[PDB]
Amino acid sequence: AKDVKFGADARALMLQGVDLLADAVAVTMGPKGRTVIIEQSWGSPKVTKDGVTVAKSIDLKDKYKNIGAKLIQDVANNTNEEAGDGTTTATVLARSIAKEGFEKISKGANPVEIRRGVMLAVDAVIAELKKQSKPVTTPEEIAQVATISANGDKEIGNIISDAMKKVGRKGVITVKDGKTLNDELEIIEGMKFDRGYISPYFINTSKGQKCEFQDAYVLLSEKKISSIQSIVPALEIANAHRKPLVIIAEDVDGEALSTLVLNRLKVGLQVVAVKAPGFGDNRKNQLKDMAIATGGAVFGEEGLTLNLEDVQPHDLGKVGEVIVTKDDAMLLKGKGDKAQIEKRIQEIIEQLDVTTSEYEKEKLNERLAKLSDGVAVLKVGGTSDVEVNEKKDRVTDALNATRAAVEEGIVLGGGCALLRCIPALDSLTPANEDQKIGIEIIKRTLKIPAMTIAKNAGVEGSLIVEKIMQSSSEVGYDAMAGDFVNMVEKGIIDPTKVVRTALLDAAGVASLLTTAEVVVTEIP
Amino acid sequence: AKDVKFGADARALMLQGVDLLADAVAVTMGPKGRTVIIEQSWGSPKVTKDGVTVAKSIDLKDKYKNIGAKLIQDVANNTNEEAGDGTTTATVLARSIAKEGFEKISKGANPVEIRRGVMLAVDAVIAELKKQSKPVTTPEEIAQVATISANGDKEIGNIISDAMKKVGRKGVITVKDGKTLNDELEIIEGMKFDRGYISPYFINTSKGQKCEFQDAYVLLSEKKISSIQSIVPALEIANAHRKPLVIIAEDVDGEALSTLVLNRLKVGLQVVAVKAPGFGDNRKNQLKDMAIATGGAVFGEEGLTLNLEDVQPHDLGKVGEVIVTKDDAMLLKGKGDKAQIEKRIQEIIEQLDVTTSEYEKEKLNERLAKLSDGVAVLKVGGTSDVEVNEKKDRVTDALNATRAAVEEGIVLGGGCALLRCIPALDSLTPANEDQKIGIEIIKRTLKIPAMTIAKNAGVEGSLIVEKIMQSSSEVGYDAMAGDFVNMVEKGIIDPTKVVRTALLDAAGVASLLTTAEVVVTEIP
Amino acid sequence: AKDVKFGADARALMLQGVDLLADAVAVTMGPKGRTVIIEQSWGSPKVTKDGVTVAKSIDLKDKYKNIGAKLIQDVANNTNEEAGDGTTTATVLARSIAKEGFEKISKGANPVEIRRGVMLAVDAVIAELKKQSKPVTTPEEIAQVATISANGDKEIGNIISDAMKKVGRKGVITVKDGKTLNDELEIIEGMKFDRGYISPYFINTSKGQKCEFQDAYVLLSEKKISSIQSIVPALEIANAHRKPLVIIAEDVDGEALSTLVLNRLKVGLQVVAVKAPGFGDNRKNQLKDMAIATGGAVFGEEGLTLNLEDVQPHDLGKVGEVIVTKDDAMLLKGKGDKAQIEKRIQEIIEQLDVTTSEYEKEKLNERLAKLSDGVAVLKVGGTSDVEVNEKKDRVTDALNATRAAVEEGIVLGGGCALLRCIPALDSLTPANEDQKIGIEIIKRTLKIPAMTIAKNAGVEGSLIVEKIMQSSSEVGYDAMAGDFVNMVEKGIIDPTKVVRTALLDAAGVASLLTTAEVVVTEIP
């Protein structure tokens, strides 16, 4: 069956669901957040203080309150960019916008004009943030930001800055467990292509739901899986030789997905299937470049007429470690970078020298970097594995924060980045009264992050937000210290990218919640 | 589904659960505790008077009262250090702290400042205990403490003191069943590595959930299990030869865990898998030392390129008895201590003579002790097995208490160790009023252990705790005698380690119960 | 789940359960007891007048009333010593003590002091009984007691006395079915070792849950079962030859228990596994003596290096009949008492002649008796099997009563043995008022046995117990006759051992019921 609710009733039930979820995730705001205890099916309760886990583990009995809580949890789950606290701010802002918009709609207003006003002013506050963003360009600035994001550690900051300097800013830096007493940095010959899992069941490591094979071959074909019969002979090589296979192809269809998943689930396979690197003639060029660097040969459609049905291990590319995420992939070491990598780099340089268009030239530059630059492996050391594992987690978080900072900038932390945009953007001209109402809604919501951090660190946040407003453009409120200390000098900063993405996602989900007119639920 | 409670409601339900569990375990306090009858599924009821079993066997229907009772039972279960009455004191202190903190929070106070005050004063009382600890250094003192901890027996005390003197203080002493009319002490060539079970289903002995094999080989490899195919050929040697195998490797992954557990559960295997001794280059050095002492050869990654896939019984190390706990492991006898142990001890001595760093030097000293010192086997005799078994249990308890005393010290027993710290630590300066409230909470809780022992031995404990406060620093209250007898002279002492650990664990769990703001429960 | 009750509530529910069970068993007191009809699943109701069956067949719906009724039934079941009416008296005394102690605790008193007073005076009444016990030493006295215990029969008394005289007092006397018109006594060469079943499923005879094999070999090994593979080849001999095997070893582990039980349950095995005779070097010496007498050879660990894995029927000891109880075992006839029994008896005599210690000397004497003395088989005859079976039961009961009398003594019957101890033990000095209360409780309970027999034989027992108190030390109350006849002269006597054991067990179980403070029950 299907129960259909209309307008105000559906909007109220969804708002109640998001209210519950947003409160449960609001308790995790600020550097002084309070823990939340979530039960586990087997074992002791899990004590967490991060909004992502809360949002993922908050279920609702009602199907409308649940349609709202998953509508807020969907945004929390789409944050697979390892963003730092970009799911708590988004959820709190979304709940505030949705609640106030619904309240004002109930008092009489056009749900579409409200959304127009909200989006105008969200765009005006994303321009203000881009204006206020302080760039992070020099190695000294990069080191300072890395130290700030590494919980104050100086070794972590120095080792992140050195890795970035040596392998290029926004370069391919990967943290790995090390067997030494102290951290060390090394550079090896590999490349990361932007294509991850095809199904979530390929994971081979609990940590980060990642999939790793220390030494294995890769199957490069430019034709997507069309029949299961294609896969069967290839896996026979993986069984015959000790080194398993890694499948990188144009695409994978449902039949291949089911076959691989079912075979892995019981027999215990160690082979993965991932989509090819990019699209267009450039997708084929990069696939051939990967085969050339790895010593392989494309087994898809070609004039040479080489097929993957007939297994030929004379040309099976061995890469060593191969780490593939739900969104990324990496071939760390290259076999054949002795004969096939010099010729191909020279060929790419020659094609660049005959550049005809910017787009093709840019893709050629990308290929050249992919092939020549390699990747920097960051080894973290310690006295014991548990200490090493904790340090690895910390350095990975610091690296992600530093990369986010390097891509855009660093704005005042503690929720003041948004709070500083209120007074500067009173110049907007809403078209109708309802657009002005939406602008007012957004103006009021920008305070909520700072209000929540202070309600989680201090006793009252209204006075704190008033003081921050009346203070100088560089003064905020250090929740840890409890004093209005210079925000940027004291090293309380958040990447511009995180705040921008959180603000945009909250606006989008709140627009969905405020515009939705009909909800179709399955009766239980 | 998931029902989410917030703040006071969740805190009250968890407090009720811990109240129930803490009462049931409070009835077991003092040397005059009262028995508690717990039903059994099959057979007669079990009559026990120890807090550990009570805590393990106390289940709650409510899921919030249960989230609190398992939160208190989790601390009781993490006591796998054979601690004596370090689970009853911890539970009672935790319940007192949680109840009073919740009551004062309800009257209005900041849950975080209360925790800060509690932790400041718990740290001040752990410093006071370390100050008041009387060392246990000389063999005469060790013998006196052993006699006190052996229920007053002098033979047990003498045999424990002799074993400690002969095999080094905090040395490797293991009690075993003996086939003689009286106790005897012998020293043999073995070593205990600090790595126990990988899953709880490897147990082979009901007593202490331990796993023993009188004579078996050990499989030493420096590469953790990567495929099940590795295990299969190794077990074939165990089947072919009468002596089974013992697997000590870098680590064991889920696939190997499942394979071994399922094969053992039905076929009746007698092989164990345990993690390697330590981490770093030292982990490999100690693994090679174990192989050299046992006559084996490391089958993990090496330049020699020796693998465990090809079974080679010419180099299978036979150890004799092998006893592995959930947290420990022991290779009691060594085959090849005739040719491979002299060379290796000389090599370790030479490397020590060329010591470059303290950490490496300390690890070299540890290896030297492991190899040369051996272990002392303590045999307990008696007229019949049941008498021998009871004496073995008693001597094991006395040995554990003596080792705890030798590691730190011996403070007044009967709950007066903590009670003596109240008057001496009124000098703390809490930062806010709430921190003073927390200090007062801790000041009041320190009495509760002595109050409970007297409520379990006498009629009222308030007057007893007042008298102990007003009496001299050496006078307490002997619950057995019912007179304020000199505590230390009358042999009522508790290890400093036990009181310290109980006090720290109670503070931690009470902090969890007082800070927890949200509880996520699965609806039934 | 687990529902936990505390103090008075749990004590009241358990007291109600024991009240029900103790009434149902109280109706079976005295020689004039009244029958109780208990339903059977299939067939006609069973009409019984013995407390043991009542107690075993009394189940309670409540889980607390049941925790008390099984707490009283546990003592009734632990009476596997074939004690005569030592389960009815124990139950009635336990109920009286528990009820009065609980009532006085409710009025305000320390449950521990009450127990101390109860135990002091129970010890004072066990000393008084040992003082009043009249010895049974001469053959005439033994015959008189046997006639009294055989329901007055003189043939039974004479045949029991003759067997005891010929095979030594407390000697190995076993009653067996005979194929003659009248009873006959014979002496054969066998020995009974004090080790019975390892699991209750080895029973092969409904009567007395005993297990018998008329002619079978015995497997003697000094190493307990370590693997199932050990058992398999041994049973193959039992299958090949018509005579089955009997397994006597150091011990049997769970795997062997399960294997043997499951194989027996379906295939219909006729082999038993029993623990070895005693412990220590004496356990091995007696096992070797058994092998030498039976013609066997120990197959456990030895310098000869003889194992039981290789079946060798040249040295399989044949014993003839082999009767093993849950607590006892017997090898009635010996093959090889022609060559291996003279040498071994001479060896034991020589070792005795070189006696060095009393304990070793006593064990040598025990071995000498075991080997030389043999056992006396008591054959009971009759016209038909049913008559023979009834006479066998009667003579077995008389023999057990006579042995109990010979071990300690014979005190006045009809419940006056305890009743005579009240006036003589008013001299105790309880330490506190509560200890005096406990002494009063015990003083009042000692009447309850005589009070119950008279309430089961006469109309009122208060006047009867008053008259017995005011009468002479030899006068009691014959319930059958209904006259205050000389108790000892009229042949109304009970063994001192039975009264002592009943009094001790009742005190212990009542102490458990009065001290228990917490009860943990599984919710249904």
PDB file of C-alpha atoms in Angstrom, chain A residues 40-128:
ATOM      1  CA  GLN A  40      25.703  -2.036  19.861  1.00  0.00           C
ATOM      2  CA  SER A  41      24.122  -5.362  18.956  1.00  0.00           C
ATOM      3  CA  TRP A  42      27.016  -7.359  20.442  1.00  0.00           C
ATOM      4  CA  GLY A  43      29.589  -6.023  22.878  1.00  0.00           C
ATOM      5  CA  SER A  44      29.853  -2.924  25.009  1.00  0.00           C
ATOM      6  CA  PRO A  45      28.205   0.358  23.972  1.00  0.00           C
ATOM      7  CA  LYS A  46      30.141   2.574  21.576  1.00  0.00           C
ATOM      8  CA  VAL A  47      31.004   6.014  22.965  1.00  0.00           C
ATOM      9  CA  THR A  48      31.533   8.521  20.135  1.00  0.00           C
ATOM     10  CA  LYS A  49      31.723  12.322  19.839  1.00  0.00           C
ATOM     11  CA  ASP A  50      31.568  12.811  16.055  1.00  0.00           C
ATOM     12  CA  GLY A  51      28.438  13.746  14.148  1.00  0.00           C
ATOM     13  CA  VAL A  52      28.985  11.337  11.259  1.00  0.00           C
ATOM     14  CA  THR A  53      28.569   8.177  13.335  1.00  0.00           C
ATOM     15  CA  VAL A  54      25.594   9.655  15.240  1.00  0.00           C
ATOM     16  CA  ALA A  55      23.850  10.521  11.937  1.00  0.00           C
ATOM     17  CA  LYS A  56      24.611   7.099  10.464  1.00  0.00           C
ATOM     18  CA  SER A  57      23.318   5.309  13.588  1.00  0.00           C
ATOM     19  CA  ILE A  58      20.105   7.401  14.239  1.00  0.00           C
ATOM     20  CA  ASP A  59      17.025   5.389  13.047  1.00  0.00           C
ATOM     21  CA  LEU A  60      13.326   6.484  13.400  1.00  0.00           C
ATOM     22  CA  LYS A  61      10.196   4.252  13.844  1.00  0.00           C
ATOM     23  CA  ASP A  62       7.858   6.755  12.058  1.00  0.00           C
ATOM     24  CA  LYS A  63       8.238   6.524   8.219  1.00  0.00           C
ATOM     25  CA  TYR A  64       7.809  10.359   7.736  1.00  0.00           C
ATOM     26  CA  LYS A  65      10.120  11.287  10.675  1.00  0.00           C
ATOM     27  CA  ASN A  66      12.429   8.653   9.138  1.00  0.00           C
ATOM     28  CA  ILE A  67      12.027  10.168   5.588  1.00  0.00           C
ATOM     29  CA  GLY A  68      13.391  13.402   7.107  1.00  0.00           C
ATOM     30  CA  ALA A  69      16.166  11.835   9.220  1.00  0.00           C
ATOM     31  CA  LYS A  70      17.495   9.866   6.187  1.00  0.00           C
ATOM     32  CA  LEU A  71      17.069  13.076   4.098  1.00  0.00           C
ATOM     33  CA  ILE A  72      19.523  14.687   6.609  1.00  0.00           C
ATOM     34  CA  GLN A  73      21.650  11.460   6.915  1.00  0.00           C
ATOM     35  CA  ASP A  74      21.934  11.235   3.072  1.00  0.00           C
ATOM     36  CA  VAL A  75      23.989  14.516   3.089  1.00  0.00           C
ATOM     37  CA  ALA A  76      26.067  13.151   6.047  1.00  0.00           C
ATOM     38  CA  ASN A  77      26.856   9.940   4.053  1.00  0.00           C
ATOM     39  CA  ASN A  78      27.686  11.759   0.743  1.00  0.00           C
ATOM     40  CA  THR A  79      30.653  13.315   2.681  1.00  0.00           C
ATOM     41  CA  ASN A  80      33.165  10.631   1.491  1.00  0.00           C
ATOM     42  CA  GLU A  81      35.781  13.423   0.962  1.00  0.00           C
ATOM     43  CA  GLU A  82      37.099  12.823   4.544  1.00  0.00           C
ATOM     44  CA  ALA A  83      35.793  16.358   5.372  1.00  0.00           C
ATOM     45  CA  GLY A  84      36.440  17.468   9.002  1.00  0.00           C
ATOM     46  CA  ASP A  85      33.186  18.436  10.840  1.00  0.00           C
ATOM     47  CA  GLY A  86      31.431  19.205   7.517  1.00  0.00           C
ATOM     48  CA  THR A  87      28.506  16.910   8.506  1.00  0.00           C
ATOM     49  CA  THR A  88      27.705  18.429  11.939  1.00  0.00           C
ATOM     50  CA  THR A  89      27.592  22.020  10.686  1.00  0.00           C
ATOM     51  CA  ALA A  90      25.580  20.998   7.625  1.00  0.00           C
ATOM     52  CA  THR A  91      23.025  19.127   9.734  1.00  0.00           C
ATOM     53  CA  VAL A  92      22.596  21.919  12.278  1.00  0.00           C
ATOM     54  CA  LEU A  93      22.247  24.600   9.593  1.00  0.00           C
ATOM     55  CA  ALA A  94      19.796  22.435   7.647  1.00  0.00           C
ATOM     56  CA  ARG A  95      17.628  21.896  10.709  1.00  0.00           C
ATOM     57  CA  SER A  96      17.606  25.601  11.554  1.00  0.00           C
ATOM     58  CA  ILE A  97      16.709  26.653   8.003  1.00  0.00           C
ATOM     59  CA  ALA A  98      14.017  23.989   7.676  1.00  0.00           C
ATOM     60  CA  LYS A  99      12.421  24.764  11.041  1.00  0.00           C
ATOM     61  CA  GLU A 100      12.299  28.522  10.522  1.00  0.00           C
ATOM     62  CA  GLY A 101      11.131  28.240   6.913  1.00  0.00           C
ATOM     63  CA  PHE A 102       8.337  25.867   7.887  1.00  0.00           C
ATOM     64  CA  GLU A 103       7.302  28.131  10.760  1.00  0.00           C
ATOM     65  CA  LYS A 104       7.112  31.171   8.478  1.00  0.00           C
ATOM     66  CA  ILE A 105       5.279  29.194   5.779  1.00  0.00           C
ATOM     67  CA  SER A 106       2.680  28.175   8.358  1.00  0.00           C
ATOM     68  CA  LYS A 107       2.179  31.903   9.154  1.00  0.00           C
ATOM     69  CA  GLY A 108       1.484  32.387   5.389  1.00  0.00           C
ATOM     70  CA  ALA A 109       4.142  32.753   2.618  1.00  0.00           C
ATOM     71  CA  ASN A 110       5.033  31.189  -0.792  1.00  0.00           C
ATOM     72  CA  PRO A 111       7.375  28.203  -0.249  1.00  0.00           C
ATOM     73  CA  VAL A 112       9.123  29.033  -3.572  1.00  0.00           C
ATOM     74  CA  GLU A 113       9.861  32.691  -2.795  1.00  0.00           C
ATOM     75  CA  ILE A 114      11.263  31.645   0.590  1.00  0.00           C
ATOM     76  CA  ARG A 115      13.607  29.244  -1.193  1.00  0.00           C
ATOM     77  CA  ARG A 116      14.630  31.939  -3.679  1.00  0.00           C
ATOM     78  CA  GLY A 117      15.532  34.302  -0.847  1.00  0.00           C
ATOM     79  CA  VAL A 118      17.399  31.564   1.013  1.00  0.00           C
ATOM     80  CA  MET A 119      19.466  30.666  -2.093  1.00  0.00           C
ATOM     81  CA  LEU A 120      20.219  34.333  -3.037  1.00  0.00           C
ATOM     82  CA  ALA A 121      21.650  35.004   0.476  1.00  0.00           C
ATOM     83  CA  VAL A 122      23.434  31.564   0.698  1.00  0.00           C
ATOM     84  CA  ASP A 123      25.173  32.571  -2.610  1.00  0.00           C
ATOM     85  CA  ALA A 124      25.945  36.056  -1.142  1.00  0.00           C
ATOM     86  CA  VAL A 125      27.509  34.359   1.984  1.00  0.00           C
ATOM     87  CA  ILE A 126      29.537  31.932  -0.235  1.00  0.00           C
ATOM     88  CA  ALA A 127      30.918  34.998  -2.086  1.00  0.00           C
ATOM     89  CA  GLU A 128      31.745  36.671   1.231  1.00  0.00           C
TER      90      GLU A 128
END
